[PDB]
Design a protein around this nucleic acid. Structure first.
Length: 399
RNA sequence: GGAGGUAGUAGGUUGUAUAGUAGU
RNA sequence: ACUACUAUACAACCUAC
């Protein structure tokens, strides 16, 4: 219930007040101080169940599939607290030992294990005091209750006392409907399809992955050729051929890599913010053409979160546990399901958001925008006391 | 590395429901 | 009413991407 650096918000302090001596999942939106409220309850954790006693202690652990989030939460969040912090990624017996009491709070990947009374599970909804982390109506309520039963969860932290601090810190993303009519160019359609048909008919796991990567790149460049003729067509073809040729040196792959580069370039010769797409070649072509015409992971992240990069391309695995500073908006090309998943990474200062693309319109309105019925299902599960949760977990423990 | 999980699509099988046709 | 075939929808399992 304490504060690491910034003053704790009223919504984050009320949600972590009942989690001191209790155990349960805590869900907070980006920009609302999620990780800030995590160190809050963690400060009162080791200061109660562990301290004053030196012998008995609780080592906070973090289980996440992303290796970049291990040192992340262990520096701007865990290290800011008065308690010790540490990061271990790919022995762990020295940091988890209660005798030395060195680096209590830890973070890493791939998870005596019962010696720690405080345990945290990051992204546990996709599957001692256990604390979880998360972002039809009968199917959603049954899945959330089953995860909270075996996952050792009772009280769910949410906005109750003050609901104004929720939308104030995290601004709602504006939904902008954009339906471009450019998809597949009918003019000279057999010329662009000749290279994709010749590459697919030229074909174990290495040969199939190279053919699937060229087919996915040609399909992404086909829709990008309608918007920009020679911009994204020559950029995606040259980057895909150079990456396959520089990955390995072989006489069999040299004929397919050299021929795909010369044929695609000759046929296509005729003429801060966040982004998510399946192919990174289309995002690099749009950012490269806009900035020209009027070991690498450390240098790229240094120029991204600092504000020097106006465009950032992420992936499906990189869409969670991210931090963006001065984000103008978030766009998606070809990637309430993905809505809150992509926007849940980081918070943007501007509430306006656009999506690059007959389609959607009333069709996407019924499928998406499920937060209306999801609000009643999430509120009913978070308001359940420990009486109904105990009987559900005890009866299902035999399975 | 390795690997599992998640999500979508396609195919096959099984169960249920509905509609149509045929037989008793 | 029962049986068989076909089509659609839902659920489960397996395989592939």
């Amino acid at each position: 219930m304490e504060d690491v650096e910034i003053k704790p918000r009223g919504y984050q302090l009320r949600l972590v007040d009942h989690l001191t001596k209790s155990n349960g999942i805590v869900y907070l939106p980006t920009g609302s101080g999620k990780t800030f409220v995590a160190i809050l309850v963690l400060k009162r954790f080791s200061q109660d169940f562990d301290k004053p006693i030196e012998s008995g202690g609780k080592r906070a652990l973090f289980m996440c599939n992303t290796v970049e989030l291990a040192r992340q939460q262990a520096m701007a969040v865990r290290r800011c607290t008065n308690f010790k912090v540490g990061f271990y990624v790919g022995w762990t017996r020295g940091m988890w030992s209660d005798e030395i009491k060195k680096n209590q709070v830890l973070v890493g990947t791939a998870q005596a294990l019962s010696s720690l009374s405080v345990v945290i599970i990051d992204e546990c909804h996709h599957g001692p005091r256990v604390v979880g982390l998360t972002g039809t109506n009968v199917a959603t309520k049954l899945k959330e209750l089953e995860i909270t039963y075996r996952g050792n969860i009772i009280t769910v932290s949410d906005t109750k006392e003050m609901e104004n601090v929720m939308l104030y810190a995290t601004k709602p993303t504006e939904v902008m409907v954009s339906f471009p009519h450019q998809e597949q160019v009918l003019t000279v359609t057999r010329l662009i399809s000749a290279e994709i048909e010749k590459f697919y008919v030229s074909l174990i796991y290495a040969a199939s992955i190279a053919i699937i990567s060229l087919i996915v790149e040609f399909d992404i460049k086909r829709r990008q050729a309608e918007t920009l003729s020679v911009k994204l067509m020559h950029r995606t073809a040259l980057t895909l051929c150079e990456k396959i040729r520089h990955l390995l040196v072989q006489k069999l792959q040299d004929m397919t890599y050299d021929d795909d580069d010369d044929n695609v370039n000759t046929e296509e010769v005729i003429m801060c913010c966040l982004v998510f797409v399946e192919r990174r070649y289309t995002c690099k072509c749009i950012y490269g053409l806009l900035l020209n015409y009027i070991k690498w992971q450390k240098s790229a992240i240094q120029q991204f979160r600092d504000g020097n990069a106006n465009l950032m391309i992420c992936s499906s695995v990189l869409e969670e546990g991210i931090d963006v500073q001065a984000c103008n908006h978030v766009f998606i090309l070809d990637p309430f399901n993905m809505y809150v998943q992509s926007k849940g990474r980081a918070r943007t200062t501007e509430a306006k958001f656009v999506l690059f693309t007959k389609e959607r319109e009333k069709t996407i309105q019924q499928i998406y925008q499920y937060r209306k019925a999801h609000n009643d299902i999430a509120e009913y599960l978070k308001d359940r006391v420990l009486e109904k949760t105990e009987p559900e977990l005890y009866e299902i423990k035999g399975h």
